[PDB]
Amino acid sequence: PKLMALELFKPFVMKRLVDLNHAQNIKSAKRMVERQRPQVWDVLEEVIAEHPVLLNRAPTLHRLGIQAFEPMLVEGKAIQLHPLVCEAFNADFDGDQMAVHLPLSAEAQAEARILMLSSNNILSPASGRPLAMPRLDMVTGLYYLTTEVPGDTGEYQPASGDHPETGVYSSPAEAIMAADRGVLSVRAKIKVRLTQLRPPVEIEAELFGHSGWQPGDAWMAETTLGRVMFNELLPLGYPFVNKQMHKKVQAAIINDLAERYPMIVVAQTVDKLKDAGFYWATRSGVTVSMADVLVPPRKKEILDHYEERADKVEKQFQRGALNHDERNEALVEIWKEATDEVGQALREHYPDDNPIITIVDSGATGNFTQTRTLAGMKGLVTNPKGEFIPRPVKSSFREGLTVLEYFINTHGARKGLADTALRTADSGYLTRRLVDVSQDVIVREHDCQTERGIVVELAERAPDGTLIRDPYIETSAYARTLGTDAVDEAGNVIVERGQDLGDPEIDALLAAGITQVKVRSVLTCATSTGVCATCYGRSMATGKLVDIGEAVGIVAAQSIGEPGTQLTGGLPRVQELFEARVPRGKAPIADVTGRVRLEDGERFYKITIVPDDGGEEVVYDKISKRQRLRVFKHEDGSERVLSDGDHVEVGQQLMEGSADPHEVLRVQGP
Amino acid sequence: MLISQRPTLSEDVLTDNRSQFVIEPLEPGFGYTLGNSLRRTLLSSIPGAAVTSIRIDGVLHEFTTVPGVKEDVTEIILNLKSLVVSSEEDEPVTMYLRKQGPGEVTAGDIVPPAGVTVHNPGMHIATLNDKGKLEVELVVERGRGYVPAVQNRASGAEIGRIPVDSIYSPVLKVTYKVDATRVEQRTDFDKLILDVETKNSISPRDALASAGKTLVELFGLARELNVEAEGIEIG
Amino acid sequence: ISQRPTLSEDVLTDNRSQFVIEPLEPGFGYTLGNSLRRTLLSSIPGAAVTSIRIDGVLHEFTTVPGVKEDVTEIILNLKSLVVSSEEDEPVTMYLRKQGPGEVTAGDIVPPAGVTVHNPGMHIATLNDKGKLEVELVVERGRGYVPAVQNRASGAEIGRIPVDSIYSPVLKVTYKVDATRVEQRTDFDKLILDVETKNSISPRDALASAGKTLVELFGLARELN
Amino acid sequence: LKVPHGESGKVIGIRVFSREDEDELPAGVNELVRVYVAQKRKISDGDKLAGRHGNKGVIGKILPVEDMPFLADGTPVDIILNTHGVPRRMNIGQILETHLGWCAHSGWKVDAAKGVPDWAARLPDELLEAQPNAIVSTPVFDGAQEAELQGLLSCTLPNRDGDVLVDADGKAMLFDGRSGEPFPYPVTVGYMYIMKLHHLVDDKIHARSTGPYSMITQQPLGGKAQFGGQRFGEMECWAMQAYGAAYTLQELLTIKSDDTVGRVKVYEAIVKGENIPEPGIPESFKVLLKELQSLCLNVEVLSSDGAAIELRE
Amino acid sequence: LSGLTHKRRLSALGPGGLSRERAGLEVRDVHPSHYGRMCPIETPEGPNIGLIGSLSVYARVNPFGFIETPYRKVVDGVVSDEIVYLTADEEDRHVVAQANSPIDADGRFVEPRVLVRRKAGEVEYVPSSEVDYMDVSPRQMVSVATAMIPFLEHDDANRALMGANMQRQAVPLVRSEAPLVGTGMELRAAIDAGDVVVAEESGVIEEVSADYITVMHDNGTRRTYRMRKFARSNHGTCANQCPIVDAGDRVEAGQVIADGPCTDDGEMALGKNLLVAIMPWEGHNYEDAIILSNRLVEEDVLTSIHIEEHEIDARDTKLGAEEITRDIPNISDEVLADLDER
Amino acid sequence: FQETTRVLTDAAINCRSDKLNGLKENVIIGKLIPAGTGINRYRNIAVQPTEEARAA
Amino acid sequence: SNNSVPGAPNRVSFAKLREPLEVPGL
Amino acid sequence: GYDTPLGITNPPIDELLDRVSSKYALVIYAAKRARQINDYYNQLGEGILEYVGPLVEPGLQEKPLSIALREIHADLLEHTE
Ligand SMILES: [Mg+2]
Ligand SMILES: [Zn+2]
């Protein structure tokens, strides 16, 4: 706002007013600024040019909570913002305020321009996946503009008889004119010649032999006009795409852009995509009305059938052959089946062009459960204890509930609201302690030269064939640093040591067929104080190797503590795990390696351990409430339940539960 | 020229053949008043000439490739539409293209009668293998805008004339963005940025001048409806 | 192809009027009408009150004896007064009444050069034993200016700044009739409907809009 | 007494109380004056609006009248909501109300030929016909049903020009006012009752460059009426340490807050144009040193080699 | 509305009661016996949730301190117009049915099996020959605030809570308008809030002026009602009253004659009627924003009035006595232009 | 953290000297924190124009 | 009809006739 | 090959980081050069033979720090450490 920028930048304005001879002395200049004479506004836009400020959104959770920015004067009395960074501030627009700080010295201005600029922090410190992506309306705009409908005007028509090919356009410059006139709709399949967009990695091979594609070479593509428009926003040289821009597709495209290109190109691309998405969302025809919400016509039949079953069950109870617990179980199962059935019917009924289905399907917002509640039927509602009411809620919010049904729904949601209220402080209580413990960890030396590392399983080769990708690949060893060169059973090495794992490196490694890799970690880092840069790995915000001196403890503390809000085990489990108290389950372990035998009775469990190599069998006595922990025996089948004769290694957990960290320490090692 | 506080001035930034025109500062709420109307006039009110329909000697049904050529009929059409022309007489004229023997066909091989010219002879059209006869008849007409894909659907005969959509206007692509800027104290005066890319027929500045002339002549009809009105003056 | 310069036709009703422009190029009868609408509703000069003085009062948030409505409602009613003027200086009008009745805009006494175009309006309901005496300032301009842009003058304590709505135009709309049968006979006929506030006849407003747009577009025709 | 930072308006009433005029007062005082300042606020950005069904929101932009989309008749809409927020919250009721609002605004006349229709069987005869903008009621857990509302939407009166603006489904064909082309698809339009919550922006916006300082702690005052500055909580301290930012943190803690010598020096340097001088040493540290020395614990600050230093002056 | 709802609030905190940290999750959620006594939807959304409730519409308090609700007497498939008030235990020991169950115009049930609530919150179908009591009105369980929300049964409970907690935060505007779709409760709400002057005894209007209204009774006695103008409320808004009647108008006792703030024609009006459209629009209403037309700022459809108060007081110091004076030490007269001699 | 008297007196007896290598202490005093742009490696950076650049 | 307060504006309502008693003194 | 950057961003951070090993060093590098430039611009009014001023043409009264970063990017400035 003007009325605030004239207050933060008061001394600079005074100086430049006294300099340009609009005021003789400082006192007159200060008077002029305070009275807001029409001379000042000319100076104000000059002084604040490219002078960054800092925006913070109290309370701040993670290191992206305070970010630099460049100011722009604007009318009104509110601080505008760029939509993409809202998720960075986790701030919606119900009236949440923000604080503005201003740096003065040359050091502070340079530091705010280089380190803390918003355009440079696109990558989340936790995972490395960019968090500045199209979010709510951009997603549905793009999902509309890139959809294809098989029955629209201007569609492709193969030649037949006296009518030659209609629907072939020389260049998209002509296609846009055609759409403007009113003959071509932007979602109809056509063949168009392209001259600036690199064809997909496959078509290029046939059409060009990889002699080298160049800007200016022509080819022909079967697309809609929409995908041609959407690919003109991605950077020059990125291969053409042909896919409906669901949420996941955009995620993948943005990830590739982040990995294979500098940050600036990614930022400019994301801005262009936002602009196009907003401009094309308005015309999407996404409107909600009472007509769009449609009630399935077969609901009555299903309701009466399951009601007949339920009343028969209740009569069988009235005959004395059933217990109350049986009554509750039978009714719960019947009504769960009924809700699933009406949900299936509803999913079938709605045409794909419904605004509700368009909103929920393209990954914008919500689930299908909310739509089922809105249209089909409520289902089952909870109790203050935590059980399910035997009586269901047949009515749907479109059709309107009754007094008693609404009463029970009211009984429902207040518990959730109270839990949401209570979890707020417990989310950050952990973060405070974590930052307390690990504030002195700083990258100090560039290397340790020590080759001790750790072993990580990249993938799995199932006996069925080919390879099975490890689900934990993107966390455990996605962005580590190697310690030893990568070579397969063949004599040709694939990746040399010291080369950080990326996405191309990981994919190539999996293609060459490697399973276990040795990588450098931070546990084995050999330095008395702090850690080492190389042993640490690749920074999660820059995307390249971490710099010397960067604080690393605080980043980890924030990263662990931030997502604690979205919990429900849980936060107490995390607290127990870090504080390392004695666990509740208190599972046993195989202090001596060997086979396991069951001698348990009905009251307690008496389990014997027969050492493989001499030794003496060691027998544990425990409670019979715990079940045996299934051990993947040498038969390679983890479904083999623990039994006498199963073969286990040293320290194997015997029954289900969580072990004492101290015993595992003194048995195995660090 | 005093009632308006500030007089807007049209700048110009050039590149190869496209250009950017900046107008600033317009009175608040005028950027979209000018941008969209100016864009539409630029696209669809600049008279020019274009190829209407083609005739090929040896074709009965148009789907199959012409004998003795490499590019299909469709690629012939796509190459031919891009070719630019410029005629003076509004009545249609006819162009003849003749080629024989192995080699390649350029645009310069078109022999135009008086009053009709081709501005980019160096355009690849088709490749002919050994012993290939290619005789094409082009119909060149004048007008404005962009005709549909098929100029005439019910109009036809056994002559084999193929109707072809034509891009009459010499302007290809026009986009515009509207930003904010400040004058005096109010900080919402519109500034218009207009990007225009055209053919080799007309330089962009001349196209913009023609568009402005057309629009002012249109609004003069509303102006003359009453001789004496106040309005607003600018410099 | 076809070379027909456009033409305009006028149809008149009581206060609103229709204007038909034809024949326009395909896909161009919309933006033209939209430009006319965006100018007619924002840049038509007019005249309206900017300040009042009431005897025996100092500020707006109060009342006066003998009147059924306090000063705030008097200002609110006086806002929608319709006044037409041509002098380029702040002119002054008076309004006084006494005794029971209904003080309406008809009792306004205008000096030379300004006119009031709605004697049937209602300003206040004057009870018995209630005087009323007000003095009005009328200016010219365009668009709209907030009242507080006038308080900086630092004049006497009695003057009450008042908002202003200089725009006379009330409602504008359009329709397009498209002859689109596939031939060279495609055109758009634009029908523009205009209604104003009984102050300025519609044709004059349309003329003002046309002149503003002509002046604006003229800067593009000049070469380098 | 001066008007606090932010207030404005016109004085409308002055109450003066004096002890000598037989008026009861608290002991120790003689004259007490209350002055009332009134101001007529408007609506702008930042102000908070809300419907009745808990769909709150904040004002984002106040477009000129000609930019708003307008119906076919030519009346621009007064407010534009968003549709991505209805299905998630399940406050579908507002949609129903919106439809009914239009049915109430333009009035309806159900056709009584061939008897009353099936959906008009239970509808009381008072609601068969209604004049324009005639108010109606709808008791909770009773009142208008979906069939009745659907029937009403199809039997609405035309406007003064013999046109029906809305359709059977409840949608209408708007025109984009910013460009000119009609919207490709019909949109939902109706009348809604909208309030104005009491979280106004003008009592939240606040700025400070250099003003009063507290006389006890040598820190700037708090609150808005005291022309104070903004709290800098420890979480921001962690967030600044995370970036590797050092000079910014030291400056935000030393020469801006409680360096009694540094602040004047930096003001003079800025207003004169020279380089910002180095930070001094915060008053909090000197307070800590005095508190420690008052407990008989000799604390001194050594130099790098080992030579003793003093922070006396 | 804010005052009316504030007067009926039931608070579980306070002296002699459990503290904020004493309260657990057992003393916050709705118990099945709240039906008809404490409204289950209205509650502050902050940390005090559950502890603070609102009394229902029809509840009244028995002499001992328990809360009674009305009921209708049903003998044997016959509904009587006698109304009997019951406490919690009596409602426990009997059987009760909903009020929206179909009834015949003669006074008999139609369907054999009707829906009935019973003890411990159970609800089931039961033949019509043993139903003891039938409720009065469908709105028997809602507070006053939540009874003013149209189409209440179509909204989720969570959003209905925020809908009921925002009418208690509105702001009176300069000139108010009655809503187009109301729920009928607002008339009684306004007339019992007490902020609208209501004629005590019938008569005719003699002198009506912006400051006072004079009415002569039938017997010839006279009365004069004074009306507060631009008086400060507690939260800074303006409390203004205006007449609606005119001279010579016959009025009857109990009829409203001067609406207060947030009232038009004696009905609770809090906001305006705006023409709305439902559509995303080029990103200015992304994530719960709202776009407004400039017409609202023009016709001041939504302008309010705020009145602040400032207090000064001069006490007797030990060095003398402070005194309100016009002669400030060394202050230029341009600063001191607007003061009087005092 | 806790029991300030205990740690204070225990440090007092031993005449313990604290080297400001941490982030809580350096932020209590007000010195540049020894992380990021505050370490001694970068603090004593000198910068001069190259000899190739000169004023004609 | 259903209104008990004299002179109040008429407000037609969708309802089923229900009148054992009116809302008590609030 | 990217679109020409606007305002603060130019010169882009990557091209800058090509010429300096570690970004923390870049911060102090730019800060010290900017201090020198401001000092020269301060003394040019009343003194001679100060530190050498900007090595590239300043625009219409732009900040010294922008000049420092711009002239690092063109590699007109050496680095010692
Ligand atoms: Mg919020
Ligand atoms: Zn290491």
Numbering used by the authors:
A (entry chain D): 444 to 1011, 1026 to 1127
B (entry chain B): 1 to 235
C (entry chain A): 3 to 226
D (entry chain C): 837 to 1149
E (entry chain C): 446 to 787
F (entry chain D): 1226 to 1281
G (entry chain C): 28 to 53
H (entry chain E): 28 to 108
Q: What is written in the article reporting this PDB entry?
A:
In bacteria, transcription is carried out by the RNA polymerase (RNAP) core (E) composed of five subunits (α2ββ‘ω). To initiate transcription, the core associates with the promoter-specific initiation factor σ (the σ subunit) to form the RNAP holoenzyme (Eσ). Most Mtb genes are transcribed by RNAP harboring the principal σA subunit and the principal-like σB subunit15 that belong to group I and group II, respectively, and share almost identical promoter binding regions. Here, we show that the stress-response σB factor from the human pathogen, Mycobacterium tuberculosis, induces the RNAP holoenzyme oligomerization into a supramolecular complex composed of eight RNAP units.
To better characterize the EσB protomer structure, we performed local refinement of the octamer C1 -map with masked R1 and R5 protomers which displayed better defined density for σB. We determined the cryo-EM maps of both protomers at a nominal resolution of 3.8 Å. Although the cryo-EM map of R1 displayed better resolved electron density for σ2B than that of R5, in both maps the σΒ C-terminal domain density was absent. Local resolution calculations of the R1 EσB map showed that the central part of the Mtb RNAP core was determined at a resolution between 3.4 and 3.7 Å and displayed well-defined structural elements. Domain σ2B was determined at resolution between 3.8 and 5 Å. Superposition of the EσB structure with the published models showed that in EσB, the clamp adopted a “fully open” conformation with a rotation angle of 22° relative to σA-RPo and a clamp-β lobe distance of 28 Å. In EσB, the β flap tip was turned 111° towards the σ2B and β‘ CC that is equal to its 27 Å displacement (closed flap state). Thus, σB4 could not be correctly positioned for the −35 element promoter binding. We concluded that the fully open-clamp state observed in EσB is characteristic of RNAP inactive state in which the σ subunit regions 3.2 and 4 are unloaded from the RNA exit channel. In the EσB structure, σΒ1.1 did not block the main channel and thus there was no physical barrier for dwDNA entry.
